[PDB]
Curated annotation (Swiss-Prot), chain A:
Protein name: Complement C1q subcomponent subunit C
Residues of the full protein shown: 117 to 245 of 245
Organism the protein comes from: Homo sapiens (Human)
UniProt free text on domains: The C1q domain is the ligand-recognition domain, which specifically recognizes and binds the Fc regions of IgG or IgM immunoglobulins.
The keyword DNA-binding is annotated on this UniProt entry: no
Gene that produces this protein: C1QC
Main location: secreted
Cited function: Core component of the complement C1 complex, a multiprotein complex that initiates the classical pathway of the complement system, a cascade of proteins that leads to phagocytosis and breakdown of pathogens and signaling that strengthens the adaptive immune system.
Curated annotation (Swiss-Prot), chain B:
Subcellular location: Secreted; Cell surface
Protein name in UniProt: Complement C1q subcomponent subunit B
Disulfide linkage: C63-C80
Every C1q domain range: 1-132
Keyword annotations of the record: Collagen, Complement pathway, Disease variant, Disulfide bond, Glycoprotein, Hydroxylation, Immunity, Innate immunity, Pyrrolidone carboxylic acid, Repeat, Secreted, Signal
Disease implicated: C1q deficiency 2: An autosomal recessive disorder caused by impaired activation of the complement classical pathway. It generally leads to severe immune complex disease characterized by recurrent skin lesions, chronic infections, an increased risk of systemic lupus erythematosus, and glomerulonephritis.
Swiss-Prot record, chain C:
UniProtKB keywords: Collagen, Complement pathway, Disulfide bond, Glycoprotein, Host-virus interaction, Hydroxylation, Immunity, Innate immunity, Repeat, Secreted, Signal
Disorder noted: C1q deficiency 1: An autosomal recessive disorder caused by impaired activation of the complement classical pathway. It generally leads to severe immune complex disease characterized by recurrent skin lesions, chronic infections, an increased risk of systemic lupus erythematosus, and glomerulonephritis.
Regulation: The C1Q subcomplex is inhibited by sulfated molecules, such as triterpenoid sulfates, heparan sulfate, or chondroitin sulfates.
Keyword Transferase applies: no
Protein's recorded name: Complement C1q subcomponent subunit A
Lineage of the organism: Eukaryota, Metazoa, Chordata, Craniata, Vertebrata
Ranges for domain C1q: 1-133
Keyword RNA-binding: no
UniProtKB/Swiss-Prot annotation, chain D:
Source taxon at top rank: Eukaryota
Protein known as: Immunoglobulin gamma-1 heavy chain
Region entry Constant (C) domain, spans: 1-216
Glycosylation sites noted in the Swiss-Prot or TrEMBL record: N66
Effect caused by changing Y69R: Impaired ability to activate the classical complement pathway
Effect in UniProt of substituting N203A: Impaired ability to activate the classical complement pathway
Effect of P100A: Impaired ability to activate the classical complement pathway
Residue pairs linked by disulfide bridges in the UniProt entry: C30-C90, C136-C194
Amino acid sequence: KFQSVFTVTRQTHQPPAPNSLIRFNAVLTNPQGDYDTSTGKFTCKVPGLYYFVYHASHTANLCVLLYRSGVKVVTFCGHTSKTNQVNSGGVLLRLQVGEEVWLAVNDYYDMVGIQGSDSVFSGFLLFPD
Amino acid sequence: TQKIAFSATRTINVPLRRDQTIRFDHVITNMNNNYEPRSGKFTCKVPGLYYFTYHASSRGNLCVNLMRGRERAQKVVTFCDYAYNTFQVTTGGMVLKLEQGENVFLQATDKNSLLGMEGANSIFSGFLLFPD
Amino acid sequence: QPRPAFSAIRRNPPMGGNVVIFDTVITNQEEPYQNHSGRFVCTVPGYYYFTFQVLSQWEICLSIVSSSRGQVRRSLGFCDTTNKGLFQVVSGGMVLQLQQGDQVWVEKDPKKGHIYQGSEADSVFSGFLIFPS
Amino acid sequence: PELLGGPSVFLFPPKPKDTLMISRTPEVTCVVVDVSHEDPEVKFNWYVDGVEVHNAKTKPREEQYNSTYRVVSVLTVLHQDWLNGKEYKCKVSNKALPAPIEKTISKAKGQPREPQVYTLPPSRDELTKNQVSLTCLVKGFYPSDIAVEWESNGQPENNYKTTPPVLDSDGSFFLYSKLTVDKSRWQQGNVFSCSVMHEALHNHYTQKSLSLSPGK
Amino acid sequence: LGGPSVFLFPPKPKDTLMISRTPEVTCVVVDVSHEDPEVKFNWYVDGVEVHNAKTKPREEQYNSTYRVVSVLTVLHQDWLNGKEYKCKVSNKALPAPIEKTISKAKGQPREPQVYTLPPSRDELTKNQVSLTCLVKGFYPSDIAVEWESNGQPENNYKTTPPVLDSDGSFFLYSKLTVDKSRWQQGNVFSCSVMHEALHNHYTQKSLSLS
């Protein structure tokens, strides 16, 4: 399409590997196939202004980093001991065709949410160009 | 065709005082330059519906007031999130119908534990949903 | 053109049931959101984004639920189980493709449903159309 | 105090001569500061081109003026590794720190450019003094890491000073070394030689001599 | 921050030695908040306040702060005679105004020796050769070195920075590059040096083939 939207989730009990890209294996919505579950990366098809946001459940320290074409854009960290909390983050980015966007973790990589608390990553095109 | 959006982070290393207007000095995005990077206020040029949001890293108790208004600002809501001897990232958001000349911004409170740094960001964003 | 968008908060909510009712409207373009029931009603088919930031001091688990043809569709959950008596904001959100008549709302887990009631701080439920179908 | 994204890290590369001359072993330092007293415990990790190694050594911690600590981990690296362009990384993590700070270090790459060595005898006018200047000009080299030494009759001269590398019109560096010797030694016909050690030299070594014209 | 930061800079050495140039001490204030950009400057020559200074329009720094610069012209003789120049910076964010003072270095002045050295015989095989000017034994380290020929200023030369010698004075080398042609043709080059300790503050040393 001439639009772009996705909401993916991480469905697995094992957290990501430290200092690695966060893979979201399950899809709630992804009509253009912009987010690739095989690589864990979003790749721009339609240029323009996008909004990216995530809500990640964790029961130990977790820092989520948003990358845009190899560059770390933002980092948000949440610390917790045994109990469950939600780490959230987001940013507006004006992207060009082919640009990749993904989330990653650093040494703080926990994404083991308690039964009933999930992790989601959404993205959608707001202004075409 | 009115493409309006902004995302700015706080990198200034100085504490927040009570009732002080949050200043997200570092701009990542500022389409239509309706957000003032220097300060921390968004000023409506094109009236309409907007969505405003933020994610604040913090090392303690934090409360923020979302503000709206023209020459006199008023508070829409107050977002509070506490942390006892630990680090946190909190968030707030709001859809607001804006008139030309009105400005939206975040204002600090008595709970001012807010971190603005590499590896622990604090960001403020806003975008136009539909033009009036 | 359609401009469906809303934000509602809590102030004087009717308690009872697991549906979380955000009684005080800040914005409600095209009145999709019913402040009396806590439910959003889709008029314009398309992709919408919904999100919440709810305040708790103990244990809370929330989910954005929807319905289509009266059929309830359970979804993702988001919790905060700090349980220390201090303010904690649980947040969550997602894009939902809705058809005319579909309803969206936030539901709490009956065993973990503590939501702050007061004037110190606020809980919000927001939603808006991303693009029509 | 407490207004930082946790403590901060700074890395340092080995000293030039150490990398060029064998008599010394390469040492890459990783220093840490702004280590609050609430969380003084610090841990380091070393990655050589990604491949981790624990042969590192950590010096004890010391106290700072404004209530901070100075922890340091010195990973004596190798000549081959460094000179080849081996990429090193020092990852540090502290509880008072939000994310694990990690920095990388490696030899300054570049064409290499081969240095030209030239010895220049004292100016006639300086010959009236009791001590004279023997000059060694080294130009056209890159990168700036280099070593210049002076010797005579198999022994090392003492009294000399080398300017720092200076960027030239074309991007290469040049420098000058000044050896001061008693006029007598110069006139007695002794032979002095300027040794230059640089990566872009055959066998990383070259020499140029200097001595009073035949005569006496 | 404890409010802004001040940095007081000395005059360009060349300016202090030529009658056709005007030397000036510069006071630079960095990290001047957008909140309070107004800055007040107070200069003092040996204690007496002066009002000839001039401030430039503030400059927006990439990291969201301001840079304010105040320029105070000085008299060649005032400066060489060792007069102290005090810059007093004031800002609302500053608990107390910041003061900075500077003056030409004191220690025994030492006059420089100038020696020109021709190209090494080996370099003569190349298309461009190096003319060398050794300058040593001077103090302070403030000095200016130039090359000229036929009364005209040369272009192609670099001078190393001053370097501390064994006896406490400084030395440096300047390298002029020219086509082997010009050298071979017997053209005369001169190494000019300007230092306070030189008789009349100026000396030259020629250099040529043969």
